[PDB]
Amino acid sequence: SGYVAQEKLAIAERYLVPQARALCGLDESKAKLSSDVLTLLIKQYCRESGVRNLQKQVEKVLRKSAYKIVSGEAESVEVTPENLQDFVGKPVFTVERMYDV
Amino acid sequence: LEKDDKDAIEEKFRERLKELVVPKHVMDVVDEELSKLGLLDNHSSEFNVTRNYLDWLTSIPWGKYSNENLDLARAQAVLEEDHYGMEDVKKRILEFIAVSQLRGSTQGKILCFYGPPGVGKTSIARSIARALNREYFRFSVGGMTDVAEIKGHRRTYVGAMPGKIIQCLKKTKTENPLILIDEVDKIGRGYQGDPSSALLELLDPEQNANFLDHYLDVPVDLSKVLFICTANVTDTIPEPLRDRMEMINV
Amino acid sequence: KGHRRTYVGAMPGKIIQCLKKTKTENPLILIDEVDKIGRGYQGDPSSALLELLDPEQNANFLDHYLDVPVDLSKVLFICTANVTDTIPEPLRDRMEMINV
Amino acid sequence: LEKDDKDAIEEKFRERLKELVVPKHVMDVVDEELSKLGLLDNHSSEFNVT
Amino acid sequence: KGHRRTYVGAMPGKIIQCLKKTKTENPLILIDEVDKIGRGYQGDPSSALL
Numbered sequence: 001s002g003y004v005a006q007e008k009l010a011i012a013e014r015y016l017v018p019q020a021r022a023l024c025g026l027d028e029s030k031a032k033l034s035s036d037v038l039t040l041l042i043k044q045y046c047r048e049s050g051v052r053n054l055q056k057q058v059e060k061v062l063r064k065s066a067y068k069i070v071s072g073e074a075e076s077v078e079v080t081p082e083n084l085q086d087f088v089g090k091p092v093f094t095v096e097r098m099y100d101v
Numbered sequence: 102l103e104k105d106d107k108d109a110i111e112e113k114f115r116e117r118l119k120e121l122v123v124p125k126h127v128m129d130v131v132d133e134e135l136s137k138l139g140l141l142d143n144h145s146s147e148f149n150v151t152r153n154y155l156d157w158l159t160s161i162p163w164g165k166y167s168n169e170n171l172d173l174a175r176a177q178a179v180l181e182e183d184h185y186g187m188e189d190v191k192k193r194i195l196e197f198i199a200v201s202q203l204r205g206s207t208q209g210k211i212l213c214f215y216g217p218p219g220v221g222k223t224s225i226a227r228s229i230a231r232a233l234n235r236e237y238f239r240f241s242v243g244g245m246t247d248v249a250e251i252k253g254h255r256r257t258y259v260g261a262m263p264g265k266i267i268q269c270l271k272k273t274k275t276e277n278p279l280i281l282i283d284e285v286d287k288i289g290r291g292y293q294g295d296p297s298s299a300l301l302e303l304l305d306p307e308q309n310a311n312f313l314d315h316y317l318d319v320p321v322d323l324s325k326v327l328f329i330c331t332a333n334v335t336d337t338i339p340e341p342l343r344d345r346m347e348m349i350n351v
Numbered sequence: 352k353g354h355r356r357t358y359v360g361a362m363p364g365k366i367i368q369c370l371k372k373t374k375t376e377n378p379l380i381l382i383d384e385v386d387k388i389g390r391g392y393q394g395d396p397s398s399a400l401l402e403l404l405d406p407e408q409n410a411n412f413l414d415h416y417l418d419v420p421v422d423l424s425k426v427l428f429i430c431t432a433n434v435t436d437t438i439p440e441p442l443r444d445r446m447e448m449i450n451v
Numbered sequence: 452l453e454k455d456d457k458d459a460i461e462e463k464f465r466e467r468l469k470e471l472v473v474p475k476h477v478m479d480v481v482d483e484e485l486s487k488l489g490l491l492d493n494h495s496s497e498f499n500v501t
Numbered sequence: 502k503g504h505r506r507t508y509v510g511a512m513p514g515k516i517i518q519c520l521k522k523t524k525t526e527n528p529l530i531l532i533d534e535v536d537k538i539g540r541g542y543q544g545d546p547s548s549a550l551l
């Protein structure tokens with residue numbers, strides 16, 4: 001049972017992402033996914049005891065990049081947190097407010 | 102004065118099986134069964150069951166693939182020609198056709214639309230089948246309460262037939278039709294082996310490749326198939342089955 | 352919807368018996384008292400009824416006994432319930448009301 | 452001949468179809484069932500069901 | 502549990518197929534989703550499982 005967010009990040013970085021990447025055929029150079037983005041995805045959108053839902057999320061971003069490259073314009077999609085909102089849609093879990101003082 | 106009916110069937114099955122790329126799991130079973138069919142006297146009551154068994158086992162396509170259109174430009178027009186709005190669903194199907202063009206070999210998925218009634222969830226499936234060009238089917242599961250439809254029967258029972266999925270996969274010669282399960286969330290609890298359990302074996306994204314319906318006992322791959330569902334509301338569905346499938350929202 | 356035909360006594364569902372007993376393909380079937388169908392102890396019969404009453408989709412009705420699809424789009428259903436609230440929403444949408 | 456067996460049973464079925472205009476789909480199904488009935492024995496639980 | 506071997510077409514229960522196919526007496530059989538068994542009319546497979 002269970003999965004701490006740290007384990008989910010390690011698993012996503014060494015098992016899921018390469019596997020989904022081979023499944024969709026994108027060259028590794030063509031669609032970078034920074035580990036910071038994976039942290040953001042684990043924290044905001046996919047937050048539950050299973051692992052499947054995280055797989056669907058990362059698979060979604062890779063699909064959108066694929067359609068953007070094969071027919072669109074950019075020769076290298078570059079996921080960044082600033083742009084991430086348009087790839088994965090509206091975030092579910094709002095971040096807690098951060099007071100400074 | 103005598104002919105060779107046994108050789109007639111023993112060759113005609115062979116001839117239908119020639120062009121298919123038959124997996125090694127099957128070839129040995131079909132061969133030993135074909136010999137067992139060759140021994141017995143023609144009228145013997147068991148012999149019929151085997152002539153039937155082979156009649157199913159050699160019929161279902163083994164790798165024959167209805168080639169699917171790849172370029173997305175032409176696909177746009179036929180997708181938009183008889184619906185409007187629903188942009189998110191059309192964006193998904195465009196993503197899918199694109200990736201299929203990129204990786205080469207055709208490959209499937211699982212999807213599950215859901216929304217308020219009458220939005221168009223059920224009339225689009227036929228249009229998608231016309232766009233990607235893979236052959237269509239439809240499979241209502243409203244109110245069903247008998248697992249046999251998804252899993253067939255054991256073949257010693259008289260008149261056993263394989264579960265409805267194999268009948269689909271034979272009726273359309275292709276190997277990767279667009280199955281369309283329908284009204285998944287109204288599937289009943291049948292007070293003995295409620296069907297909702299059996300579907301779990303069918304929809305695993307990875308384990309699906311070894312479906313094991315009882316009648317023809319050799320496992321059949323199904324990964325190429327493109328299932329779709331529909332659900333008026335997404336609460337009734339049992340939790341693991343809710344988890345297997347993507348949830349687009351019209 | 353009948354049974355699977357590999358059982359002992361399987362017979363096609365009630366509608367196909369209707370459609371054989373009256374030689375025409377377009378009888379005026381009169382489902383009656385739709386409000387008081389059973390519910391909540393086995394699979395809802397209502398969940399089967401939708402497959403009949405969809406105005407277009409019914410053209411490929413598929414009775415389990417004789418699995419080959421049975422076109423029946425020409426039929427003229429009628430229904431008669433005395434209070435139009437209990438009917439579940441997805442089914443209530445299919446069929447236009449007319450208030451006596 | 453109060454009890455039929457193979458020939459006449461198929462014959463009366465195939466002729467009963469005539470006035471009807473069957474959709475082209477089901478003629479295949481009826482054809483496999485007929486030929487399978489032709490190869491089947493007159494006494495077995497399979498025959499009466501088919 | 503198979504059938505009685507006297508019926509037409511009888512075949513042994515599924516586990517013996519597993520032995521004959523794995524061709525060894527110590528396989529790693531993996532029953533799956535144990536809790537969904539139907540345990541109803543004329544069966545009670547849960548009894549055979551015990």
Ligand SMILES: Nc1ncnc2c1ncn2[C@@H]1O[C@H](COP(=O)(O)OP(=O)(O)OP(=O)(O)O)[C@@H](O)[C@H]1O
Pocket residue numbers: 183184185186187217218219220221222223224225331333407441
């Ligand atoms: N965007 C649309 N454009 C044109 N027609 C539509 C659209 N959406 C729905 N329809 C109409 O809806 C009818 C069938 O809709 P559909 O069967 O998908 O309803 P539904 O949402 O499936 O209902 P339920 O899911 O309860 O069965 C078709 O006649 C079709 O014309």
Ligand SMILES: [Mg+2]
Pocket residue numbers: 222223224331
């Ligand atoms: Mg619908």
